Amino acid sequence: EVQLVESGPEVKKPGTSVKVSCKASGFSFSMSAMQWVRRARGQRLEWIGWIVPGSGNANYAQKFQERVTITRDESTNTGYMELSSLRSEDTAVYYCAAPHCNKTNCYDAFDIWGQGTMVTVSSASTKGPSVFPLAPSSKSTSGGTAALGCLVKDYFPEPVTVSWNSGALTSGVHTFPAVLQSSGLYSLSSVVTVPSSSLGTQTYICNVNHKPSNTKVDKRVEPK
Amino acid sequence: AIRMTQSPGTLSLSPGERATLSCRASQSVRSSYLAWYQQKPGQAPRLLIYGASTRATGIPDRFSGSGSGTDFILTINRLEPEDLAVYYCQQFGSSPWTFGQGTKVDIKRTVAAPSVFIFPPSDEQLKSGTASVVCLLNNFYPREAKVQWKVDNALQSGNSQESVTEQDSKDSTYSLSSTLTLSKADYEKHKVYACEVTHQGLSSPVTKSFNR
Ligand SMILES: *[C@@H]1O[C@H](CO)[C@@H](O)[C@H](O)[C@H]1NC(C)=O
Fold first, then answer.
1. Residue A77, class by beta-carbon neighbours within 10 Å (0-12 exposed, 13-18 middle, 19+ buried)?
2. Which residues constitute the domain of residue B53?
3. φ, ψ for residue A119 (rounded to 5)?
4. Within this chain, do residues A113 and A11 fall inside the same structural domain, yes or no?
5. How far apart are the CA of A28 and the centre of ligand 1, in A?
6. 4-33 in A: which are within 8 Å (CB) of B?
7. Which of B107, B132, B161 is a domain's end point?
8. Inter-chain CB proximity B134 and A149 less than 8 Å
């Protein structure tokens, strides 16, 4: 599988340095160029720089020339992007892109993209979430379908991953975007609509993963 | 640096209609170095068109790229509800490889009233000294919906927070989640907790309530 897999989420104090990984699989990594792009929450894409295949010759935008260093490692098939002198405006999702290649030929554009690495810059400390059940009841049933969910509350920073029944349940799931509470922590809710007759004979577990705090919680939501 | 300007900022179209997106550069860029990307909610960007008019692998034939010099066009012949996303153009023949501000494509559909569900706070949260009451508005259109909280017929304002999902890729509906936050002490003093929902799909406001 032609893949580009970046590292996990980050929390960095203002003034520190972050180094995002970007490991390749499936294609000839040494033949492939690599560009780096970021995007702040609710903004447009911002090009950072790119590196030529084979050598370490890189080229950066003037905005990131002074504090961004794009490297690559042919032995471990991983490209890196290190951003020093981190400030508040650097909080964004950083992507790596590359054309797929075999031993001799390459694509003419960047078609392979990483899933993105979310980097948050703040003095606030990391905090794991509390997962509470949104239990189904008579006041959450309409027709033959019932709604249940999980409240992922009081965590920092973004993001969190929520799946249901280890990914076996996707139909009818709505994971809402987080809101920034007045306390400085985030709070998220994920819900799913299921038939009412399944509540007694089918178990429902929301899988919550907050990588910045190494917090994995499997909360079972039971009827009330 | 080459400036890339996309217009319009947002395009709301019915499924089956033809979408038209503009990408313009402050100077002439080589056509083989202009790319179009598609970024759907919660996903990485996806290469649609490269070389101005060459569809990438796996891209359906309803996507079409055209233009040259300083004016480039993306065309979606028959718009499908799955095509909702932000579409970016990028030039990568002259450093810096600048991007456009992107064009957001929404899908139009018939009015759909929401389904309202309310969730009392769990006993586990009540042990922490806080109480969260959640109101769920499920699968509605248009996105405009009013959610008011009442606690013993006292209108709550300033202590609730809402959140709306992106438009669903299948039925083109939205879903909202409002969370009322009260202290465990304040939550135990009252009985009737209700969220009232006003929406275009409802003849009159719908109220979902429970007694503590
Ligand atoms: C590399 O891919 C091209 C197609 O782009 C193909 O024509 C060529 O034979 C391939 N070579 C090798 C060594 O895989």
1. middle
2. 4-107
3. -115, 125
4. yes
5. 11
6. none
7. B107
8. yes
